[PDB]
Amino acid sequence: SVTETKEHIRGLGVDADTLEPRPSSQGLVGQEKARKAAAVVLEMIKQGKIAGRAVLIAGPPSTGKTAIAMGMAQSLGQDVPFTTLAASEIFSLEMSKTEALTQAFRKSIGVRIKEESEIMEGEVVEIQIDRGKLTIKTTDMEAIYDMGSKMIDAMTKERVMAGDIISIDKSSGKITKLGRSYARTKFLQCPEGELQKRKEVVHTVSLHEIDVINSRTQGFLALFSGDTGEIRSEIRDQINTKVAEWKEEGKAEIVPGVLFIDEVHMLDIECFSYINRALESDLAPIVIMASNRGVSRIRGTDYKSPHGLPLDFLDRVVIINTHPYTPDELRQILSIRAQEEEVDLTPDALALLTKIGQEAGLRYASNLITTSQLIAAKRRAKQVGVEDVQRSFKLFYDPARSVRFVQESEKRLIGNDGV
Amino acid sequence: SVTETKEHIRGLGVDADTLEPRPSSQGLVGQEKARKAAAVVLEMIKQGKIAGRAVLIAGPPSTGKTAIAMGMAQSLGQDVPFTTLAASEIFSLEMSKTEALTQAFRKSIGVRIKEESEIMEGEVVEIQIDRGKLTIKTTDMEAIYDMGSKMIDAMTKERVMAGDIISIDKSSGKITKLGRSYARTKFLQCPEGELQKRKEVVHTVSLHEIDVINSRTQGFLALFSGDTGEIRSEIRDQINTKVAEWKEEGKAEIVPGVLFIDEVHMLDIECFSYINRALESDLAPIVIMASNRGVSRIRGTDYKSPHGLPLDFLDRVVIINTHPYTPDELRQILSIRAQEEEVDLTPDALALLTKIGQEAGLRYASNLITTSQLIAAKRRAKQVGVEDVQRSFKLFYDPARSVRFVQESEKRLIGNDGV
Amino acid sequence: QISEVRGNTRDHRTAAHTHIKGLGLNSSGIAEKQAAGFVGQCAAREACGVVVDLIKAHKMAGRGVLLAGGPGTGKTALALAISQELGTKIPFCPITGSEIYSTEVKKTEVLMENFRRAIGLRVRETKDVYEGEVTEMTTLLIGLKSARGQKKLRLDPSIYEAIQKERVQVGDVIYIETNTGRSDAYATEFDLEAEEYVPIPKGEVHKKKEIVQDVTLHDLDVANARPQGGQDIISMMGQLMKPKMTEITDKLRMEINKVVQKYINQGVAELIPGVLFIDEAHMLDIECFTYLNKALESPIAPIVVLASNRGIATIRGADDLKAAHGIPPDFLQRLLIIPTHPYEPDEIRRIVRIRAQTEGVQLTDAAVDRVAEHGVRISLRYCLQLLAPASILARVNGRTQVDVQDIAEAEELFLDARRSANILTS
Amino acid sequence: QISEVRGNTRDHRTAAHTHIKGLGLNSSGIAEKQAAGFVGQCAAREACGVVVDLIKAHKMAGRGVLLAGGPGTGKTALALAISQELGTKIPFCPITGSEIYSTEVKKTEVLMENFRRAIGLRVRETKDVYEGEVTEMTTLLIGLKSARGQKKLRLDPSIYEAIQKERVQVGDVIYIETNTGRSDAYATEFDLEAEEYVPIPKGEVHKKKEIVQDVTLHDLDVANARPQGGQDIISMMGQLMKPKMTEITDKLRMEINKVVQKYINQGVAELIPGVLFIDEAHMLDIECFTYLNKALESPIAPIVVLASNRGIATIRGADDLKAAHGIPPDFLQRLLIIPTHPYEPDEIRRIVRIRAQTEGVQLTDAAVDRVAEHGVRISLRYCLQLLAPASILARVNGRTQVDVQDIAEAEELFLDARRSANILTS
Amino acid sequence: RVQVGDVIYIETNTGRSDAYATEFDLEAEEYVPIPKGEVHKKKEIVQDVTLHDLDVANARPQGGQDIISMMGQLMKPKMTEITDKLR
Ligand SMILES: Nc1ncnc2c1ncn2[C@@H]1O[C@H](COP(=O)(O)OP(=O)(O)O)[C@@H](O)[C@H]1O
Ligand SMILES: Nc1ncnc2c1ncn2[C@@H]1O[C@H](COP(=O)(O)OP(=O)(O)O)[C@@H](O)[C@H]1O
């Protein structure tokens, strides 16, 4: 079929009228300065003289800068393209730098049209797991449907389960939770009549998805074959002219999304030239970049600057900054990611993970959640305790301990320093 | 049509029999050692065992070494090819290193033949300027002729004006001042009969000009189109065989000219290989090189030598040296370049330009002449005074003051040194 | 190829200089402080005046300008003022040397594109043509028809003998050049094509129209990069459409030049060279400066203004050879170097007021002082950016007029480059 | 392809060694000072003698020579003397390692060209042929005619049966190999072509000519690089004609070798390997020495003499690995290293006298002393150059005999490399 | 395309000159000879011919003689010189 531009966080967590950030509702956690700074940038974008500027989010690793970008993406609205790209992924054998950058940008520009489709609406009954099958009914009929990996993902993302009244677009596979029939959020009543109805609906698809749709479908096991992932220019030219025609006609509307480039210090002068040329088109999305470096080398030259951006670029970008989470914030984040992975922690366990999160970082602390879950399971323990978080901490090292441990083979002292 | 090999200085300014240089007649100014050294080299070339050697002219910037090369070129005679090439111009996207070097050398090798042509001879009446139209007459008729950029150049170069008896080759556009009808140098009488006569004349054209003539004429705005400037080998082969045939027949005679390569320290090992291979042909011109460096790196290798020439090359070259002009010489040079740009200076003004020329160099001092001229004009001043040379000195900086000024943003002391 | 064309200029680049309307100089070439949008910097302005005068006097023989100074100075603004002083609708193409570093285009291929953006074409031709289907052919009276309207003409013998040349009879569709074909109506359903049938000129019998248009060589290029049957996708979604820009070809450019020279020959159009401004000039390499050297020689080329805020830098394309501003000697020789000074706090406060009244955001006198202190601390660039956010933070709690509290929070929400790094370093 | 060919040697390179006529050694292989053009340096000369003897004895199994010493030494001169001692008309190809660095040719493509310059071909065949139109065919008497001249021959039965093989009758144009066709006259205007008609041998009825010629493999290459209908442009204007030299092709070289082997098989020609001398050997890279290693193995290859005035240098093509003279170990192993010494003032004065009497410029005994002191101060190279200018400065005020005043002004008009730099540095 | 001095034609009722050519030009060339040897040409064309006279006249290329009217039938069996396109 196709795929709509819905590919967790609902917003910036900010007062609609004050732009003052409530700490955790949307929910982002902490980073109130950076989130209010984001709200201002958005208000600057929504209408004003921002005029084709990138956004730089600088801060330590495992801050909330990646999440803020999505928080910025949602504030613009659902069905508004949000694509994330690690700057290093631009360098591969699958495709050239120019190609990868084009796909990334075209993934962030959505084409919106009104067309009829077969949408489903009913109350969920059952959902299954494998190494699925959705049972849905109305007041008139019940049905069982089969589905694959891509399908099961979007549903678990939209947080769906038995008792939820949902809406499935058979043409794009877009799931939408309308409400609930009973408790186990909006209390709606079960849909009446036909389970499947043909309705006129708005479809928003990226320029890249359209390119993919009109290309020879990628073969099974594409990754491990030598097959490249570039898109034929003749196909793009075909898609560009038709999208330009639809815009002139009125059939289509262009919806600029958000392109978030992480570890942007990996880009070279040539990459920044492209990003500069792209931002000069009206169709251009909001380019948001994130760096973990204080000062870095400008790749492509022998010049160093803050975050490793060309001095020209830095004069154009809007810089937002993030900071280390407070222990309370870490404790709140890890507790959230624990229930999302379905892990029952002990108050002590969470406390140790928080202390671990301080010492080694949020991502590392997060990794230890699932390993601890399995250790508790091997134990048959009723709940994930501190005894398990400690044992996983001794089994799986973080980067700092790892490099120290490997350096331990060639050591420098017993009574004093030696070399 | 075509263009003859006349593309300011009439000689070395040297005693014809002593080789002792009169200071300024030809006129070059000063550099008497270097000019006498040049005269010896020429006498060595004219007949003897010089045997395919390049000439290196080393000395500080804005000396007379560029002018001496032309002074050497004229001593060989008019209609003897003289081409000047900045070593860095060899590096471009328009053409390869080998191509640029071939054109440069072929620009310095002239093909001389006797053929009939339509030459004009008459007394000039008027000359005009635009953003021209030559009126010429004889004792039998008068005529008005239109002309373009290339034409107006050659005339102003030959120093022509109303009252001059001149000669214009309608086939090559070669202007020749025969004399004068009245005062405003040889006092000749006005030409009689037909204004245009068909005569047998010697035409000397470079191998490159012939190549250009037999190629598709360069399109208008050629520079700003992507058009390359190389010459098709099939065209060269055509020109080479015919020139070889004309030489065998006796129709043509090869006239080796002078190739002057400035800032020769920009050439790499590969460039010096070419220049070495070219000098091994009988048709090879006199290669004259000029460097501003004491010691430089041999580009293409990790070896350093005087002027940046391969140690092999240095053992073959004849080295002439120039020195800083004396204040009197600077004063004489700047006064000459002032009347040539049509600037009326005050004795004080010239004095300050000379002091400026000492401090910042001859080229910089020269630049300040025209800027001062315009400042005096804005003032409506009758003559260019010191008040104008001073104001242009404060407005337009030289390189030394410029780098110091830009360094001024990050300064190193107020009470003492800081860093 | 088409004569009338649209032009999409990159106005993002001169958006921070919308107040600069000129250099603001006296009749005697002396700078007036706080005139034409400028504030102080009188020396650089007066210097530009000499440059503008040298250009108009054609005394600028194969030379260029170099603006040396720090970031906060008025380097780009000065260049813009130069193009303005050089006349009306003069092309201005500002770039940075870092732009020419492209993945799928050579460094000079990029420079050449920009040269075309800085070369304008003033077209001031008036075309008067009486067209339509012929109705009479008789002291020579010829008639013409249009959709709604009919004119009977009075011709001289000279035109009816030039009409004897062109295939013309009654009633066909014809064109008339005042200064210098089967009609659609007679077509039968049985003809189809190939056909000789064309529509009658609708809906005027005359056409004394005046053609007034100014465009750059690049506007012509892009206009003819689309075929009949497609839209202007290049200026709609330029870089995003595909990796490599194959639409603008060499053959296409030389066809433009071939056409451009034709309009000039007919005294219809004059091509007016503008101003090509290149920031971060030290980013160019030797091959780039070799191209620029050739440009400086051409009579029909834009004035080349360079800028740099580096005193000494390695000449790119050379073996660690350092020179003034990163410019090679062979090229630096041809430049009039104009130095730009930093600004006094009172000069900075004035500039901020000018910018704010242009945005235009209203702010207190205390706010202006706070914004200018960042113009001293950091560049004039950074502090000027603080206006937008503070205005938003005001309006949100507005209190529409901006205060010090607003600039205070804005300076904490949006750090400058140097701060952001040194804070992250810790 | 043609047998007889012209050879244009690069005599610019051995112009400074026109006095070197040999090594000047005794019958016992001991060097005589100031003999054969040489002066002192007896050790290197005697060493070369052993090399020349090892070569003639074929004991030089896959080995080469390396001349180690300073600039002023007799390195290039020694190599030239080696080729001379190796026999008559022995090929000598001197080059510098810096030459192989070409823009449009690979480093070894250049070496290979020079190997061909150092491989000679001695052709000593005597061809005797009786040609012309046949007139008689009868103890076998056959007649022949020429432009002016007629011969009646006396043939044996063995040739008239070999003549029975070739298409031969009276009267046709025929060729006769002593040791081992319609005549032009019968052509009618009505025939045209294709034709079988050829001219009668003008203007001799016989041809017992002796072919005596010595040429290098490169002389053959260039000779056949021109087609019938063109001139010898390659040796007229070699490098100047065009950037890339496409005339000499692989197929052309192997056709030469195919022909060269044929002449050898017929005992007509012997190919004589000469001397390939390469200065600045440290300029070669690993890929160059790999080629030279293969060369040293071949029996039909020129003796490879290398020279270097560097004690230790980085092996090019290796990761900053330094070795003796810049030569790799795998190759240095195959070299007999001969060291060249600097010269005493009296040795230098003698050399200058020899050179001056060769130029030949006459100069005083005081002049010789002044020129030799620059042979000590600077190289023997620089001071020897001072002769020409001084001779000119003399002759101009001549006073044709050169004096000290002349060398005095010449040394001030023409500085050496080191002086010119250090003076400019200031 | 007209300027001084080029070779031009004038129709009363209704180009580089050969002189300026240089030996270095060759071709392709824009050079043509000057009209020899009259500066005017008010000539009267008076001729009567059949359609067949035109046919045969153009049956020969520049570089050949009038062989058709010299030895019509004898030159060859089939007369392929006069073609439909030519008529
Ligand atoms: N003298 C001045 N008068 C008014 N505005 C100025 C002046 N100098 C700089 N500006 C403004 O301050 C900002 C500095 O930018 P710009 O001149 O482009 O700096 P750069 O030196 O980096 O090119 C711009 O908004 C510019 O319009
Ligand atoms: N022993 C010698 N006897 C005579 N002439 C010599 C002697 N040694 C060197 N020369 C001459 O001195 C000059 C030095 O050049 P050359 O031998 O080629 O030096 P290099 O060591 O650099 O190869 C040449 O003119 C050479 O003929």
CSV table of N, CA and C in Angstrom, one decimal, chain B residues 22 90 100 105 110 158 207 250-251 283 297 299 325 327 363 366 378 399 413-414:
chain,number,residue,atom,x,y,z
B,22,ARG,N,73.0,52.7,-19.9
B,22,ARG,CA,72.5,54.0,-19.6
B,22,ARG,C,71.3,53.8,-18.7
B,90,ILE,N,48.7,28.2,-14.4
B,90,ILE,CA,48.8,26.9,-14.9
B,90,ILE,C,47.8,25.9,-14.2
B,100,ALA,N,47.9,24.3,-20.6
B,100,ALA,CA,48.2,25.6,-20.3
B,100,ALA,C,49.7,25.9,-20.6
B,105,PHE,N,53.8,28.2,-24.3
B,105,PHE,CA,55.0,28.0,-25.1
B,105,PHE,C,54.7,28.3,-26.6
B,110,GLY,N,56.9,32.1,-33.0
B,110,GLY,CA,56.2,32.8,-34.1
B,110,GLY,C,56.5,32.2,-35.4
B,158,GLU,N,50.9,52.1,-28.8
B,158,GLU,CA,51.8,52.7,-29.7
B,158,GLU,C,51.9,54.2,-29.6
B,207,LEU,N,52.3,30.2,-33.0
B,207,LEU,CA,51.7,28.9,-33.2
B,207,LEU,C,50.3,28.8,-32.5
B,250,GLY,N,59.9,26.9,-47.7
B,250,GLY,CA,60.6,28.1,-47.6
B,250,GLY,C,59.6,29.3,-47.4
B,251,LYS,N,58.3,29.0,-47.5
B,251,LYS,CA,57.3,30.0,-47.2
B,251,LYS,C,57.3,30.6,-45.8
B,283,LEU,N,63.0,24.7,-31.8
B,283,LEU,CA,62.0,25.7,-31.9
B,283,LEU,C,61.8,26.4,-30.6
B,297,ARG,N,60.0,25.6,-1.1
B,297,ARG,CA,59.8,24.2,-1.2
B,297,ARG,C,59.7,23.8,-2.7
B,299,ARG,N,57.8,22.1,-5.0
B,299,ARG,CA,56.4,21.6,-5.1
B,299,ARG,C,56.3,20.3,-5.8
B,325,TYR,N,64.8,49.4,-5.5
B,325,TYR,CA,65.1,50.7,-6.1
B,325,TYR,C,65.6,51.7,-5.1
B,327,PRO,N,65.5,55.6,-3.7
B,327,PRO,CA,64.4,56.6,-3.6
B,327,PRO,C,64.3,57.5,-4.9
B,363,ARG,N,54.1,48.8,-6.3
B,363,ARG,CA,52.8,48.5,-6.8
B,363,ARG,C,51.7,49.3,-6.0
B,366,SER,N,51.7,52.8,-6.6
B,366,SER,CA,51.1,53.0,-7.9
B,366,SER,C,49.6,53.1,-7.9
B,378,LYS,N,37.0,64.9,-7.1
B,378,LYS,CA,35.9,65.2,-6.3
B,378,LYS,C,36.0,66.5,-5.6
B,399,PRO,N,49.0,45.8,2.4
B,399,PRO,CA,48.9,44.5,3.0
B,399,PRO,C,49.4,44.4,4.4
B,413,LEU,N,49.0,43.5,24.2
B,413,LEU,CA,49.6,44.4,25.3
B,413,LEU,C,48.9,45.7,25.5
B,414,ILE,N,49.0,46.2,26.8
B,414,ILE,CA,48.6,47.5,27.1
B,414,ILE,C,49.6,48.1,28.1
